[PDB]
Amino acid sequence: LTRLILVLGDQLSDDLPALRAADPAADLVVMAEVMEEGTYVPHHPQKIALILAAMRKFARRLQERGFRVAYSRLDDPDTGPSIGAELLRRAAETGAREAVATRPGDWRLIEALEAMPLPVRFLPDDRFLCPADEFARWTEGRKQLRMEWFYREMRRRTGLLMEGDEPAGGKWNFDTENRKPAAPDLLRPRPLRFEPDAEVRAVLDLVEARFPRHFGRLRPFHWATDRAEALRALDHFIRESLPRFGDEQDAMLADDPFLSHALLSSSMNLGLLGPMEVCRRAETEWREGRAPLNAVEGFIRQILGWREYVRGIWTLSGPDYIRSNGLGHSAALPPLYWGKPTRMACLSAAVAQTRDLAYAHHIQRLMVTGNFALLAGVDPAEVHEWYLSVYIDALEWVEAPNTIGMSQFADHGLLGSKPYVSSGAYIDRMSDYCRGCAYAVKDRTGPRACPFNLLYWHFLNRHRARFERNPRMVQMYRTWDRMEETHRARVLTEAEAFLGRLHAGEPV
Ligand SMILES: Cc1cc2nc3c(=O)[nH]c(=O)nc-3n(C[C@H](O)[C@H](O)[C@H](O)COP(=O)(O)OP(=O)(O)OC[C@H]3O[C@@H](n4cnc5c(N)ncnc54)[C@H](O)[C@@H]3O)c2cc1C
Ligand SMILES: Cc1nc2c(=O)[nH]c(=O)nc-2n(C[C@H](O)[C@H](O)[C@H](O)CO)c1C
Ligand code: SF4
Ligand SMILES: [Gd]
Ligand SMILES: [Mg+2]
């Protein structure tokens, strides 16, 4: 009569569907720290540490609430290699004939649990604002998807920034106001960091010993490891940084890795925060004249729009999504991505902070590291491995669409009809990187030519047949055509030379 109740490491929510369905008197909660989940990609040590530590804390909390918990520690030699091995073990110990599980957000894990010779009753993950079945319904018959239309509908369903049947402040979307560079500022707060207690430190010591060859600096470790801490991170952001969120959303500063971003993605993704509570707090700040509407709406749109939309695309696209390669790109990831030196200031900055903090803000992920990998023709499978490995907040469901779709343009165009690529001019306008860089951003050719200046046109040229039949990009080819033929030839000869060095592993 005992049933197993699985709680995975991204399911640390009090009101998790599986827990709702359990009988604390009869059922056994099962949690397991296992090598398979620690190595399916070589996760940033900070990520591994975050999950294991939050797992232990949550297990103890489940005990405080009355559940019986069977917890398999990574450092127990009795622990098996996978979530499945531990479910089976506990079935044997217990007599249970069935496990209940909130459906995870990783296709490989889904399949593993189905393949397990123990039946699993899956429940939907209801921690999103848009239910799966409702996302599917909204998309049906649409020959083209666009996040914006989905977002407006989510605004209406939820009531967020809605004054009647009208959007707050008389228009829907304020992204046009959120695209300026930012200045250094004494009055700009730094986000809240958290010191590990002894139990987190025990996990840090474990991860250092057990996963030494993964890319990333483990210490200092500063992320929230339970709900109490995450709520403080929330409060900090709402009070101190939300009013700048809009003006500074696309900015980059060589000396500030965080600017005014919330640094909440990991907390939301593991279940420590929920999106409604986050969006509502932000809305209140507008209603009380503390945060401007471009800021609050910009913030909400990232969670209510993109986060939700991305989850939907993941769900619909299935287990073969990560095999998408619409542009036929096949190059290795350059060594600079795993920390080898590069003279490109922007990339260096981004990879360095990814190494050290397990965190890059959105515009870095999209327009620096993402943009460069696309321009250089890296296989999207390789880009996908990297983003899913290196960031504190990375799990398949949220990383895959952002990486394969939004950034690498490898899919059907569901996350943007125009690829996010640029020349160096864009990085120059939005950051202060270029003055410190050995490359010359204003040079279109020559030994000092910014590599984005070469690869941008090379990219457009090599994919002209497909992109020129694309309204939103016809202009760019017009500008290319109006240039002397010898200038074009030189640009391509030089991009080609660069690419040869890049993909040979030469420092660039
Ligand atoms: C190539 C690529 C890979 C990405 N991988 C991840 C990932 O693994 N995990 C992840 O949570 N986000 C991912 N993103 C989206 C976004 O970059 C991060 O969510 C954001 O950087 C998290 O930092 P923050 O908390 O400071 O976010 P903020 O800038 O403060 O934004 C606020 C919140 O909005 C949400 N958000 C904003 N953009 C997105 C997005 N496009 N998709 C989903 N949520 C969004 C997050 O919950 C975030 O906490 C990726 C984006 C790109 C381009
Ligand atoms: C590194 C890691 N380790 C574990 C683990 O040891 N045990 C566990 O239950 N979950 C872990 N996770 C999170 C899962 O991989 C997660 O459920 C999927 O990545 C997405 O739902 C991760 C990411
Ligand atoms: S010149 Fe080019 S490579 Fe150097 S920081 Fe600017 S955009 Fe990056
Ligand atoms: Gd492939
Ligand atoms: Mg933007």
Three-class secondary structure of residue 15 per DSSP: coil
Find the 265 Cα to ligand 1 centroid distance in Å. Answer: 6
User: What contacts 168, CB < 8 A, 6 or more positions away?
Assistant: 161, 162, 286, 293, 297
* C-alpha span between 452 and 426 (Å, rounded): 10
Q: Is the peptide bond before 212 cis (omega within 30 degrees of 0)?
A: no
What phi and psi, each to the nearest 5 degrees, are found at residue 118?
Answer: -145, 135
Tell me the sheet residues that pair with 167. 162
Find the 492 Cα to ligand 3 centroid distance in Å. Answer: 18
Q: Count Cβ atoms below 10 Å from residue 459 Cβ, excluding itself.
A: 22
Rg of the Cα trace of the chain?
A: 24
| Token output for 22 | 């359990």
Which ligand lies nearest the alpha carbon of 345? 3
Residues with CB under 5 A from ligand 4 (ion): 325, 381
Amino acid identity of 180?
A: K
User: What contacts 387, CB < 8 A, 6 or more positions away?
Assistant: 365, 394, 399, 402, 403, 407
Q: Whose CA is nearest to atom 8 of ligand 3?
A: 346
Stated as kind and residue range, the H or E segment containing 475 is: helix 474-481
* C-alpha span between 139 and 413 (Å, rounded): 14
- Minimal CA–CA distance to 243: which of 168, 148, 178, 172? 178
| Token output for 454 | 């070469």
User: What contacts 32, CB < 8 A, 6 or more positions away?
Assistant: 71, 72, 79, 80, 83, 86, 87
Pairing state between β 99-102 and 166-167: unpaired
What phi and psi, each to the nearest 5 degrees, are found at residue 407?
Answer: -90, -50
What phi and psi, each to the nearest 5 degrees, are found at residue 181?
Answer: -70, 175
Three-point CA angle 165, 169, 172, nearest 5°: 65
User: What contacts 149, CB < 8 A, 6 or more positions away?
Assistant: none
To the question of whether residue 349 is assigned a binding role by annotation, the answer is: no
Three-point CA angle 101, 115, 102, nearest 5°: 10
To the question of whether residue 80 is assigned a binding role by annotation, the answer is: no
Which ligand lies nearest the alpha carbon of 53? 2
Three-point CA angle 93, 95, 97, nearest 5°: 125
Which ligand lies nearest the alpha carbon of 206? 2
User: What contacts 81, CB < 8 A, 6 or more positions away?
Assistant: 34, 35, 36
- Contact by Cβ (8 Å): 240, 189: yes
* C-alpha span between 269 and 307 (Å, rounded): 10
Q: Whose CA is nearest to atom 1 of ligand 2?
A: 38
- Minimal CA–CA distance to 394: which of 94, 87, 46? 46
Stated as kind and residue range, the H or E segment containing 100 is: strand 99-102
* C-alpha span between 355 and 369 (Å, rounded): 13
Protein residues whose CB sits closer than 6 Å to any atom of ligand 3: 344-346, 424, 427-428, 433-434, 437, 439, 441, 450-452
Burial 361-377 (b: 16+ CB within 10 A, else e): bebbbbbbbbbbbbbbb
Q: Whose CA is nearest to atom 2 of ligand 3?
A: 450
What phi and psi, each to the nearest 5 degrees, are found at residue 194?
Answer: -130, 130
Q: Count Cβ atoms below 10 Å from residue 98 Cβ, excluding itself.
A: 12
Question: What's the half-sphere exposure (Cβ side, CA atoms, 13 Å) at 409?
Answer: 24
Three-class secondary structure of residue 435 per DSSP: helix
| Token output for 228 | 């109490």
Domains of the chain: 1-127+193-225 (3.40.50.620), 128-192+226-317 (1.25.40.80), 318-438 (1.10.579.10), 439-508 (1.10.10.1710)
Find the 54 Cα to ligand 2 centroid distance in Å. Answer: 11
Pairing state between β 162-163 and 166-167: antiparallel
Stated as kind and residue range, the H or E segment containing 17 is: helix 17-20
Torsion of CA 227, 232, 233, 239, to 10 degrees: 150
| Token output for 114 | 């189905």
Protein residues whose CB sits closer than 6 Å to any atom of ligand 1: 261-265, 268-269, 302-303, 306-307, 310, 361-362, 365-366, 370, 387, 391, 393-394, 398-399, 402-403, 406-407
* C-alpha span between 465 and 461 (Å, rounded): 9
Tell me the sheet residues that pair with 68. 28
To the question of whether residue 261 is assigned a binding role by annotation, the answer is: yes
Tell me the sheet residues that pair with 72. 32
Q: In Å, how far are 339, 390, 444 from 355, measured between CA atoms?
A: 7, 8, 31
Q: In Å, how far are 83, 144, 454 from 472, measured between CA atoms?
A: 46, 15, 21
Tell me the sheet residues that pair with 378. 331
What phi and psi, each to the nearest 5 degrees, are found at residue 432?
Answer: -110, 25
DSSP letters, 188-240, are: PPPPP-----HHHHHHHHHHHHH-TTSSS---S-----SHHHHHHHHHHIIII
* C-alpha span between 30 and 151 (Å, rounded): 37
To the question of whether residue 310 is assigned a binding role by annotation, the answer is: no
Q: What is residue 123's DSSP assignment?
A: E
| Token output for 96 | 């249970």
SS3 content of the chain, % helix, strand, coil (to 5): 50, 5, 40
DSSP letters, 376-430, are: TTB-HHHHHHHHHHH-TT--HHHHHIIIIIIIT--SSSTT-SS-----HHHHHHH
Q: In Å, how far are 106, 138, 139, 240 from 143, measured between CA atoms?
A: 26, 12, 9, 42
To the question of whether residue 98 is assigned a binding role by annotation, the answer is: no
* C-alpha span between 275 and 280 (Å, rounded): 9
Three-class secondary structure of residue 356 per DSSP: helix
Three-point CA angle 197, 202, 207, nearest 5°: 120
Q: Match 């030189």 to its residue by tokens.
A: 490
Three-class secondary structure of residue 71 per DSSP: strand
Which ligand lies nearest the alpha carbon of 404? 1
Q: Whose CA is nearest to atom 1 of ligand 3?
A: 441
Protein residues whose CB sits closer than 6 Å to any atom of ligand 2: 8-10, 32-34, 37-38, 43, 48, 51, 83, 104-106, 109, 395
Find the 391 Cα to ligand 1 centroid distance in Å. Answer: 10
| Token output for 395 | 């799990």
Q: Whose CA is nearest to atom 23 of ligand 2?
A: 37
DSSP letters, 151-183, are: HHHHHHHHTTTEETTEEGGGSS--GGGS-----
To the question of whether residue 393 is assigned a binding role by annotation, the answer is: yes
What is the longest distance spanned by two Cα atoms in the chain?
A: 79
Helices (H) and strands (E) in the chain, counts: 23, 7
Full strand arrangement of the beta sheet holding 4-6: 68-72, 28-32, 4-6, 99-102, 120-123
Q: Whose CA is nearest to atom 7 of ligand 3?
A: 424
| Token output for 278 | 């986050």
* C-alpha span between 88 and 103 (Å, rounded): 18
Question: What's the half-sphere exposure (Cβ side, CA atoms, 13 Å) at 40?
Answer: 16
Using CB atoms within 10 A of its CB, is residue 474 exposed (0-12), middle (13-18) or buried (19+)?
A: exposed
Find the 331 Cα to ligand 1 centroid distance in Å. Answer: 26
Q: How was this entry determined? A: X-ray
